[PDB]
Amino acid sequence: MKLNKQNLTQLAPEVKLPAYTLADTRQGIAHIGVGGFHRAHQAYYTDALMNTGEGLDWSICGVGLRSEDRKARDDLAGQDYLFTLYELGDTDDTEVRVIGSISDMLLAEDSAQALIDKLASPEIRIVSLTITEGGYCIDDSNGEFMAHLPQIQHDLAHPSSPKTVFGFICAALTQRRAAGIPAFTVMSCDNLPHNGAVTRKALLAFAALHNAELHDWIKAHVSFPNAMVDRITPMTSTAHRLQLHDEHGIDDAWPVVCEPFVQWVLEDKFVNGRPAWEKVGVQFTDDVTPYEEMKIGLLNGSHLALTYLGFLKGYRFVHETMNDPLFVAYMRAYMDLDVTPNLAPVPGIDLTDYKQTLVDRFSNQAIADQLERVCSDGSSKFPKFTVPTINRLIADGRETERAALVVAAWALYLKGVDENGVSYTIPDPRAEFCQGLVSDDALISQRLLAVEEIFGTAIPNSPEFVAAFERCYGSLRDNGVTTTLKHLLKKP
């Protein structure tokens, strides 16, 4: 049965449906970057709220800034913007549900002015973001905005025909301001420590490139709440689409698969209101930092620790790494010895229990999360997920070898051949550049570790870290992943 408004009431009985009248909803959120995570997290909670009969004026208008986004728009439009959220997990606590909280989706390429007009509409009160970990154009080492990027210079030169996220937000804010319409909140839903502060730094820096007056008005009228967001969401696959049809009878052109667990912790800093998400499990706090350091350092950090070694070993799913005891032991040693000592207490959460739940969640066999997905964009992920932990170990004079192995694994992985002799390409926005850094084994540590916007300055200047990196890399190249882990694990 094709999913659409006509067949909504004709689906299998186990399929959960929106409880609200789809036609009564109105838009309040414009979301930039309509991918799997947005649909399985923000759209999911917004749909849940609407099912309680509240927040019907907070429907989401998706926004696609890239040509690849046309396919999402077409697929959703062909189903009256409905899509299936398909939970997969090793227990029965999984549900299949049709989500109705996204009511439209605009593509910048169809008309920049139509998109600016949507973003400047008074009913749109929050502009949310999933533009990836490296989408903010802020150098972690020195905190500066990359003003010299081509697309950034283009937007400064043609402010009414922007291409970038900051260009569209600025154009919309100036148009609202000219019409006497209040600003919206900009709500980052990407995985970065202090993601709201980063969003603010970037937008303000870009605004200052226009003038101080605009930079100052945005600083005083727009809020940028920080948040921790969590829900494992694999890439779309034909197998999952066929499984949804086989098991629940729905023909969905683009369902979103995700794990049952979901979490959202947010600072309540909204200038123009927000849905009452707290009624459906979203947690507001006065300080999200402990939550963000906990989740990014342990979950996202462990994902990088497993993914490159896993890919080299020939594994292709996260659960496969979890079926290898050496990988589980390595992950636990990384979490227990390297990350945990750096964490401040997190209200309402026991870290020992939490670490165990990460092992359980990564061990989900039914979800089939692709190592290609977790591996992707390491150039942007390392400074967010792993380097902060390494810097602390270096400053403390603590053992860096487990953390260095993650970087050594990435370096060998960049050569593009796994242990089964299979050649693969690198899904990274800076693939060519990174691959060139590892072309000469004799110069790898000197060249790879010297990229400041990825590794910072403590790493290349630490003889202890450099030594750990070099021996890990040599060991992986010569003895392979398994033996390297065996040796590392028999280490106090």
Ligand X SMILES: OC[C@@H](O)[C@@H](O)[C@H](O)[C@H](O)CO
Phi, psi of 106 (to 5 degrees): -105, 145
Over the window 223 to 242, marking each residue x when it contacts ligand X by CB under 6 A and - when it does not, the resulting string is -------xxx----------
Residue 195 in the binding site for ligand X (CB under 6 A): no
Residue 451 CB: number of other CB atoms within 10 A? Answer: 19
Check the annotation: does 36 bind a ligand: yes
Over the window 274 to 313, marking each residue x when it contacts ligand X by CB under 6 A and - when it does not, the resulting string is -------------------------xx--x----------
203 versus 262: smaller Cβ distance to ligand X:
262
Residue 331 in the binding site for ligand X (CB under 6 A): no
230 versus 418: smaller Cβ distance to ligand X:
230
Least separation, in Å, of the C-beta of 370 and ligand NAD?
10
Which residues does residue 423 pair with via DSSP β-bridges, in sequence order?
A: 417
Which of ligand NAD, ligand X, none binds 303 (CB below 5-8 Å, type-dependent)? Answer: ligand X
Least separation, in Å, of the C-beta of 334 and ligand NAD?
19
Check the annotation: does 191 bind a ligand: yes
Among 28, 33, 193, 297, binds ligand NAD (CB under 6 A): 33
Name every residue whose Cβ is closer than 8 Å to that of residue 230 and which is 6 or more positions away in sequence. 261, 262, 263, 264, 295, 299
The DSSP-derived string for 205-243 is HHHHTT-HHHHHHHHHH-----EEEE---PPP-HHHHHH
190 versus 453: smaller Cβ distance to ligand X:
190
Instruction: Write the DSSP symbol of residue 99.
Output: E
118 versus 231: smaller Cβ distance to ligand X:
231
Look at residues 292, 363, 311 and name the one whose alpha carbon lies nearest to residue 332. Answer: 363
Residue 66 in the binding site for ligand NAD (CB under 6 A): yes
155 versus 428: smaller Cβ distance to ligand X:
428
For residue 184, which amino acid is it?
Answer: F
Binding residues with ligand X: total (CB under 6 A): 9
Q: What count of Cα atoms within 13 Å lies in the side-chain half-sphere of residue 44?
A: 30
Which of ligand NAD, ligand X, none binds 374 (CB below 5-8 Å, type-dependent)? Answer: ligand X
324 versus 377: smaller Cβ distance to ligand X:
377
Check the annotation: does 392 bind a ligand: no
Which residues inside 156-195 make contact with ligand NAD, applying CB under 6 A? 165, 190-191
Residue 225 in the binding site for ligand NAD (CB under 6 A): no
Check the annotation: does 133 bind a ligand: yes
Residue 299 in the binding site for ligand NAD (CB under 6 A): no
Q: Which residue has its beta carbon closest to ligand NAD?
A: 35
| Torsion angle (degrees, nearest 10) of CA 336, 339, 343, 346 | -60
Check the annotation: does 226 bind a ligand: no
Check the annotation: does 190 bind a ligand: yes
Name every residue whose Cβ is closer than 8 Å to that of residue 412 and which is 6 or more positions away in sequence. 308, 312, 438, 473, 476, 477
Check the annotation: does 350 bind a ligand: no
Least separation, in Å, of the C-beta of 371 and ligand X?
10
The answer to whether the beta carbons of residues 463 and 300 sit under 8 Å apart is no
Cα 181 to Cα 122: distance, rounded to the nearest angstrom: 6
Residue 406 in the binding site for ligand X (CB under 6 A): no
Only one residue has tokens 């779309």, namely: 236
Check the annotation: does 425 bind a ligand: no
Task: Show the 3-state SS of 382-437.
Answer: HHHHCHHHHHHHHHHCCCCHHHHHHHHHHHHHCCCECCCCCECCCCCCCHHHHHHH
Look at residues 407, 302, 301 and name the one whose alpha carbon lies nearest to residue 359. Answer: 302
Least separation, in Å, of the C-beta of 132 and ligand NAD?
4
Residue 355 in the binding site for ligand X (CB under 6 A): no
Cα 226 to Cα 21: distance, rounded to the nearest angstrom: 32
Over the window 381 to 400, marking each residue x when it contacts ligand X by CB under 6 A and - when it does not, the resulting string is x-------------------
> Residues forming the annotated binding site for NAD(+)?
36-37, 66, 69, 133, 190-191, 233
Interface contacts to ligand X, rule CB under 6 A: 191, 230-232, 299-300, 303, 374, 381
